[PDB]
C-alpha cells in the first residue's frame, strides 16, 4: 500500500508546465505515495488574486517543512501585465523564495547514453552551482573615479583610485561581497557534495583578483578544514581548488561525477535545486520555464511534445531529500525507481520531439521519432508500474 | 618560377607544433612563394638564452612588418621551470605581443562539409571576438564602500554607494573601461567584417548593467554610422546588435557566415586565431591549440604520431592573404586561397588525420585506414597542392 511520504511544499505553476504538472502528480506521485501536502497556488492569476501574498507564505512553508518541489511560474514584465491586466508587476516568486531561504542552487544535465552530450565523455553528469549587487555608471568626460571604504568604528577612511580618466570617458563599477554570503556558498557547496557523494571543485581566479577571489578560496579552505574534511574521507570524497582554466580542461577531459563550484543539451532535461546551508532545506524545480510556444498550441487544441524530465526529478529530487531527513527508506527508494524509469524510457527509444530532434536533427525528425505530451507521460506510468512490481520480489 | 611574397615576420615554437611548422614552410610554402622573411626563434631555449628578448624582438618586428605568423609555444610553469631548467618563469610569449601590439583577437573553426559542426546547419564559417585592469581590496567591515566619480571639470560630484556591510566585511572592487578600448574593438571589428565580407553582431547582456553594455552598444553604432556604414551597404552588409540570448538563439537556427562581437565577460586542429590591431594594418595569424605535447612525448619515443596542421597552415594562408592584399599582391593573394582550398578539399575527400576521423566515427570506432598519419597528410596535402597550382596555370 502507499507510502509514507511526510511533510512536502508544493507549489503550481503556469502555463505548460502547471499543465504536465498535474499529469506527474496523479500518474507518478500519487498512486504510490501519501503526503502531507503543503500545497500553494503560485499561478500568476493567484498570485495577482492574494497580492503575491501567496508566494511569501510559501517560502515561509518551505523553511518550516525543509522540503519544497516547484513548478514553472511566469515572472511578468509589461507584455504580461497587459496579458493579464495585472494589478501591478510582481517579483519573480523565484526571487522572492530566494531571498527568504537563501543557498545555493545547483544544476544538474541528467544524462541517457543515446543522448549526445556537449562533450561524449561525461558518462557521469556534473553539478554546477553558481554564486548568486553591481552598481555601474557611466563616465562622461575627464575626471577621477576612486573607490572609497568607511569603517564604522571611526578607523581611519581608505580610498583606491580605480581610474584617472585624463582624456576621453568611459564607464566603471563597484562590486562587493559579504563573508556571510561566501560562508553559506561553501557549505551549500559541502553539503550538496555528500549528499550526491562526488568531489567538490572550486574554480576562481585569484591570480588577477588576488584580494577578492583570494578571500573564496580562503573562505572554503578554512571551512573545508575546520569541518568536512573527515566526512568527505569517509566517502572518499575530497575539495580541491582549481583556477578556472585548469577546471575547463580538466573537466572536458573528465567523465563527470563531481561538483562544481564557480564564482560567477536539451532543457528538459535539466533540474535547478537550491540548497540552503543548513543542509536541512531544500528547493527543487525544473531549469527551463513554462514552455509558453507549447502552450499556446495546446489551448488551440494541437498536438504539443513538451519533456517532462526536468519537471519529474524536481519531484525525485525532492522526494530523495524528504526520505534522507527521514530514514525513510521506502521513499528513499521510490524517489529512485521513478528517476530510473525516466531515463530508461528514453534509453529505449520513447522520447519527446525535442530529445527526438537531439538525435535525427530538427529537420529529418518524423512524427513516427517521438511520442508527444500525454502518451509519455503514460508510457512512463506503465513502466513505473512495472519497475515497481518488479522490486516487490 | 616563385611568386614573391614580400616582407613576413614569422616566430617558430615548441615540441610537435615546430614540427609540422618546418613541414609546412619546406612541403607548402617555400617551393612556391619567395619572402623576405624576418623569421625569430620563440622556441623555449632560445627565449631562455636570449632572456625571452627575443620574443620582444618578434613583437616589434610584427608592430613594423605588418604581418606576423606564429608557431605555437611553450608557456612555462613551475614543471617546465624544472624541466628545461628555465632561469625564470617567463610570461606566455602570446602576452608579450599582444601588450605590444594591442587589437582584438578574432578565433574561426575552419568548415568541411565532412565534419560534423556544432550545429548540422552551419556551412559557413562564424568568426568570433571577444573583447579582453581592475583594483580589488579587502573589506574588514563593516562600513560604507562607495564609489564617487568627481569630473576633472571641477564642477559636480556624484557618490555611488556599493554596499553597506553591517553583518561583517568582506571583499569588494572598481572596474573601469576606457571609451579608447572600447573604440579601438570596434574598429577592429567592423574592418573584419568588411575584410571577411560578412555581417557584424555585437551581442551583449545590457539588461543586467544597463550603463556598462549600453556604452558599448553606443559606441558602435556611432562609429559605424560616422565611419562604415556606405562600406557595409556598398558590399551588401550590414552591423547590428543584438542581447546574447537572443544572438544565441538566431545562431542556433542559422548558416553561419557572420561576424560576431562578445563584449561578455569539436576539434582544435581546425581552430585559428587572428590578433587584428585596430590600425586595420597590422595582423598577427597563429593557430588556437598549443603545441600538441601529447603527441610529441610519442614522436619522442618513436610511436606514430597523427597531428592536425591545418590551424598551423592557416596561420600561414591568413597572413599571406593579409600580405598580399596590402601589397595588391594579385599572385600571392591566389596561392593564399589555393593554399586553403587544396586544404579543405583533401579533407572532404577522404583524407585527414585521425582527430577528424574521430568527429565522424568517434573515438572506439576509428581504424588505422580511417586517417593519415602526420607525415602522410602532409605529403597528400603536398601533392594536391601542386596539382591545384597547375591547373590554375
Ligand atoms: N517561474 C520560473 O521558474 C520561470 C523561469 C524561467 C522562465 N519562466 C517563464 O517562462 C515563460 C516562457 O518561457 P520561455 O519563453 O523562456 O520558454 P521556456 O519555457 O523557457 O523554454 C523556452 C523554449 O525552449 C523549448 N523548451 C523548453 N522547455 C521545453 C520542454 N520541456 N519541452 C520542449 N521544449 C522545451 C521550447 O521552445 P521550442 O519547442 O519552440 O524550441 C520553449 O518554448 C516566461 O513567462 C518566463 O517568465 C519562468
Ligand atoms: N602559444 C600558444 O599558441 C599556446 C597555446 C596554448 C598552449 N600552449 C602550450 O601548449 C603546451 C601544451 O598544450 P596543451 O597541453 O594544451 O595541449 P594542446 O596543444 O593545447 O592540445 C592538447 C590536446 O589538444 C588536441 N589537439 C590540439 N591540437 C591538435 C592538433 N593539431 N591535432 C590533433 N590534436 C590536437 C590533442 O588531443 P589528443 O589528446 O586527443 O591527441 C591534444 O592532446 C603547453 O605548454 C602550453 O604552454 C601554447
Not at 173 to 188: L, P, R, T, V
Request: charged share 25%; glycine share 8%.
Amino acid at each position: 500500500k502507499k507510502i509514507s511520504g511526510g511533510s512536502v511544499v508544493e507549489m503550481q505553476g503556469d502555463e505548460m508546465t502547471r499543465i504536465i504538472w498535474e499529469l506527474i502528480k496523479e500518474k507518478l506521485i500519487f498512486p504510490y505515495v501519501e503526503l502531507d501536502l503543503h500545497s500553494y497556488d503560485l499561478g500568476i492569476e493567484n498570485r495577482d488574486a492574494t497580492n503575491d501574498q501567496v508566494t511569501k507564505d510559501a517560502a515561509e512553508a518551505i523553511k518550516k517543512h525543509n522540503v519544497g518541489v516547484k513548478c514553472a511560474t511566469i515572472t511578468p514584465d509589461e507584455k504580461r501585465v497587459e496579458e493579464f491586466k495585472l494589478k501591478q508587476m510582481w517579483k519573480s516568486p523565484n526571487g522572492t523564495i530566494r531571498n527568504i531561504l537563501g543557498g545555493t542552487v545547483f544544476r544538474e544535465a541528467i544524462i541517457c547514453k543515446n543522448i549526445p552530450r556537449l562533450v561524449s565523455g561525461w558518462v557521469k553528469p556534473i553539478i554546477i552551482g553558481h554564486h548568486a549587487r553591481a552598481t555601474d555608471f557611466v563616465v562622461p568626460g575627464p575626471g577621477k573615479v576612486e573607490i572609497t571604504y568607511t569603517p564604522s568604528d571611526g578607523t581611519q577612511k581608505v580610498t583606491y583610485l580605480v581610474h584617472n580618466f585624463e582624456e576621453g570617458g568611459g564607464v566603471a563599477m563597484g562590486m562587493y561581497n559579504q563573508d556571510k554570503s561566501i560562508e553559506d556558498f561553501a557549505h551549500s557547496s559541502f553539503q550538496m557534495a555528500l549528499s550526491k557523494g562526488w568531489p567538490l571543485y572550486l574554480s576562481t581566479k585569484n591570480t588577477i583578483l588576488k584580494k577578492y577571489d583570494g578571500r573564496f578560496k580562503d573562505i572554503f579552505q578554512e571551512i573545508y578544514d575546520k569541518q568536512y574534511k573527515s566526512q568527505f574521507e569517509a566517502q572518499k570524497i575530497w575539495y580541491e581548488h582549481r583556477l578556472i582554466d585548469d577546471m575547463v580542461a580538466q573537466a572536458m577531459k573528465s567523465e563527470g561525477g563531481f561538483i562544481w563550484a564557480c564564482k560567477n543539451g536539451s532543457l528538459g532535461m535539466m533540474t535547478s535545486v537550491l540548497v540552503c546551508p543548513d543542509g536541512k532545506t531544500v528547493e527543487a524545480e525544473a531549469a527551463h520555464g513554462t514552455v509558453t510556444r507549447h502552450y499556446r498550441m495546446y489551448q488551440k487544441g494541437q498536438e504539443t511534445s513538451t519533456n517532462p524530465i526536468a519537471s519529474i526529478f524536481a519531484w525525485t529530487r525532492g522526494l530523495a531529500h524528504r526520505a534522507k531527513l527521514d530514514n525513510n527508506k521506502e521513499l528513499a527508494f521510490f524517489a529512485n525507481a521513478l528517476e530510473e524509469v525516466s531515463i530508461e524510457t528514453i534509453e529505449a527509444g520513447f522520447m519527446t520531439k525535442d530529445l527526438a530532434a537531439c538525435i535525427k536533427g530538427l529537420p529529418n525528425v518524423q512524427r513516427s521519432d517521438y511520442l508527444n505530451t500525454f502518451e509519455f507521460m503514460d508510457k512512463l506510468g506503465e513502466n513505473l508500474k512495472i519497475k515497481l512490481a518488479q522490486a516487490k520480489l
